Design a binder for this molecule. Sequence first.
Ligand code: 76P
Length: 286
Amino acid sequence: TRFHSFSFYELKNVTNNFDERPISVGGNKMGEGGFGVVYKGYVNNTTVAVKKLATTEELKQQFDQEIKVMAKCQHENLVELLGFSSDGDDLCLVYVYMPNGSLLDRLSCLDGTPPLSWHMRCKIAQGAANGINFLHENHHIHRDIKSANILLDEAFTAKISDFGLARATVMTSRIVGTTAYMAPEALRGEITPKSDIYSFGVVLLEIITGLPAVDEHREPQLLLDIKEEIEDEEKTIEDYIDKKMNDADSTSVEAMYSVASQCLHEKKNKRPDIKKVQQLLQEMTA
Ligand SMILES: CN(C)[C@H]1CC[C@H](Oc2ncnc3ccc([N+](=O)[O-])cc23)CC1
């Protein structure tokens, strides 16, 4: 698949000169979304998201990786790239606008949005698993699966984003990702699709609980420690269910928790593959 080459001056125009002010006050900055700031804009009546990136060469290599992965990978559960603008050091990626922001923002009810229902949460978990399955089937490792990288469209369909660190068991000298979601082997430099499964297991715990992966003012500060508290029978998954829901039944919650627990196996080889995760999430609803 081939993309439209946008002019930098056309992108600067539609985003009102990359205004750093918020949307409510009058600007276009949505906030930031990964080694770059994201801006709302309108191209030919179409609402778009423009990610201005943002060593300079490492950032250009992430820009190229995103475009290469997006050219090869088009799926219902991946964000859609429309085009880009290279033109010097200010690199821009243009996407279809995702009006419901990220799953992290919706789980924390950022800016006063209503809590996501259990029904919406089950659909989002299944959609995100379908997107990771598509990447794995096409021999790609995302390397940064987290709720901030699961975007939500006009119908709350899950859309995986941020493919700058994606790769087609190998080791690396540059350890990348988000600590609170990373598998133990990924924190040691290993590169494998099994690390994406582990990180997805952390996302499933954020969905069940509404709690972020890391909270500096919390005990435990890391969400993955709750798997040990439950396994030692000190507590149960019902004690951690997000209280901002009225439609969560304990049977399907325990079925989603069982998938998350399996994803979070410390031994990479004992985790299920994405196809099994996808099958288990379908059986939960059905
Ligand atoms: C913190 N929070 C307000 C974030 C919510 C999500 C915002 O990002 C985005 N918002 C809307 N559409 C997007 C389309 C593509 C990408 N992308 O990067 O592929 C990011 C997008 C960035 C701010």
